[PDB]
DNA sequence: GACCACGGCGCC
DNA sequence: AAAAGGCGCCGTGGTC
C-alpha cells in the first residue's frame with residue numbers, strides 16, 4: 001500500500017527487519033526497512049543502513065537494538081507494539097498472534113514488517129488511551145526496561161570454558177558407573193534415557209508398585225517424586241535418581257554452554273524475553289540463564305563457571321522472602337506485616353520446624369527445602385503431597401497447613417476477594433494494574449476450575465514482585481553506567497552485576513539501596529547482597 | 541535436518 | 553504423582 005521512497009527514512013519512522021535466526025546476537029541482518037507518513041523506505045544494504053537510525057521503533061525493537069549494540073552502534077529501542085499488546089493481555093506473546101489480532105500479518109519481509117509495526121502501534125495505542133495504569137507501566141517500566149535488557153543481552157557473561165570441559169570428562173565416567181549398575185540390577189541393558197523403557201523395567205519386569213500416572217497419556221510415572229517413594233523397594237531406584245541428576249546437568253549445562261561462546265565478544269549471551277509469561281515475569285532463553293544449577297554439589301560446581309572479567313567482580317543481589325512481603329502488602333494481614341517489621345524469617349522458621357532444629361543450626365540447604373514448602377502451601381499444595389515430601393503422617397501435614405494460614409487470617413480473605421473479583425471482571429491484576437485474564441474460573445470441571453483459581457490468585461503476587469524488580473532495574477541501570485559497572489543477569493528476584501574491583505563495594509551498596517527503596521510497601525524490602533569472582537561465591 | 545507432544549526436571 | 557504457581561531445555565518417540 002505504502003508509496004515506495006528512498007532510504008533513509010525520516011525521524012521517528014517505524015522499523016522492520018528480518019533476521020537469519022531468532023537470536024539477535026547470532027543473527028545475520030538480512031533486510032531493513034522503515035515506514036512513516038504513508039511511505040516505505042527499504043534499505044539497499046541493511047548493515048550500512050543501521051547507522052542512519054537514531055532509535056529502534058517497532059515490533060521486536062529490543063532485538064534489533066541488541067544486534068546494533070553487537071555492531072558497535074548505540075541504537076536504543078523505543079516504542080514496540082508487542083509491549084502494548086502484552087500489557088493489554090499477557091497472552092499476547094508472539095508477533096504472529098499480535099498482528100493477526102490487532103490488524104495485519106507477520107510476514108518475512110522487512111518493508112511489510114515496518115508498515116505492520118506502524119499500523120499495529122496506532123491501533124494498540126488506541127486501545128490503551130483511557131487505561132492510565134497500563135500506560136504508566138508502559139512508559140515507566142516496560143519501554144525503558146527494553147533498553148536495559150538490550151544492553152544486558154549484548155554484554156553477555158564470562159564463562160570458564162576449560163573448567164566445564166574438564167568437568168564433562170569426570171561426569172561422563174561417573175555416569176557410566178551408575179548406568180552399568182542399573183543394567184546389572186535390571187539384568188540387561190536398555191535406553192535408560194527413555195522413560196518408556198524404564199517404565200517397563202521397573203513396573204512390569206521388576207514388578208515395582210506403580211504410584212502415579214502421567215498427565216496427558218496416563219502412563220505409569222517414573223518421576224523423581226515417584227522414584228523417591230521407591231528408594232527402598234529396590235536398589236536400582238537410587239542408582240536411577242543419581243543417573244538422572246548427572247545426565248540432566250551434563251546434557252543441559254556442562255556440554256551445551258561451552259559451545260555458545262560468541263566469537264567476537266568471548267562471552268555467553270542469553271535473551272531476556274519481555275512478552276513471554278502470564279504474570280509479568282521475564283524469561284530467559286537461547287540459552288536459559290535463569291535456571292543455572294545451584295542446589296546440588298555438582299550444580300554448584302557448574303554455577304562456579306560463571307565468572308567475572310579479570311579486574312572485575314560479580315555482585316549478586318536477591319530480594320528476601322519477596323513474594324511473602326508482597327502478600328503482606330496486597331492482603332494487609334496485620335500479623336504478617338509484623339513478621340517483617342520484626343525482622344523474622346519464615347523460611348528459617350519453617351526449616352526449624354521441618355527438621356526439628358533451632359533456627360541457628362538451619363543450614364542453607366535446609367532453608368531451600370522450607371521455601372518449596374512455604375510457597376507450596378501458600379499457593380495451594382495438598383496435605384497428601386506435603387505429607388509425602390516431608391515424610392510425615394498425613395495428619396501432620398494437615399496440621400502444618402492448618403497453622404500456616406491461621407497465623408495470617410487476611411490472606412484467605414484476600415484470596416477469596418481476588419477470585420471473586422476475577423470471576424466477575426474476567427481478570428486479576430497486580431499492585432500496579434498489570435492484568436491476567438483467567439476465564440477458566442467459571443469452568444464446570446472442578447479440576448480445571450480449581451487449577452484456574454490457583455493460577456488466578458498467584459498472579460497478583462508473583463506479578464507484583466515482577467513489577468518491583470523491573471522498576472528497580474530501570475532505576476538502577478543509569479546509576480551503574482555512571483560508575484562503569486554492568487547489569488548482566490536477572491533471575492526473577494535477583495540481579496547479577498559486574499563491577500570493577502575498585503568500585504564493586506560502592507556498586508553493591510548502591511544497588512542494595514535502589515532495590516530496597518524501589519517502591520515502598522507496608523513492610524520493609526530487604527536485599528541480600530554478595531560479591532565474588534564467581535556467581536556461587538557472590539551469594540551469602 | 542526439523543516439527544511436535546510428552547515426560548521430566550533445572551531454576552525462581 | 554500429588555488441589556502449589558511461573559518459566560525453558562533435554563531426550564525420546566514419532567513423524568515429516
Ligand SMILES: O=C(CCCCCCCCCO)NCCC/C=C/c1cn([C@H]2C[C@H](O)[C@@H](COP(=O)(O)OP(=O)(O)OP(=O)(O)O)O2)c(=O)[nH]c1=O
Pocket residue numbers: 295318319320321322323324347365368369371372375376492493552557
Ligand atoms: O532446592 C530445593 C530443595 C532442597 C532440598 C530439599 C529436599 C529434601 C528431601 C529429603 C531428603 O532427605 N528447593 C528449591 C528452593 C528454591 C525455591 C524457590 C521458589 C520461589 N518461588 C517464588 C516465591 C519467591 O518469593 C520468589 C523468589 O525466590 P527465592 O529468592 O528463591 O525465594 P525468597 O525471595 O522467598 O527467599 P530468599 O530470597 O531466600 O529470602 O519466587 C516459588 O513460588 N516457589 C519456589 O519453590
Ligand SMILES: [Mg+2]
Pocket residue numbers: 318319320321322493
Ligand atoms: Mg529471594
Ligand SMILES: [Mg+2]
Pocket residue numbers: 318319491493494552
Ligand atoms: Mg532469588
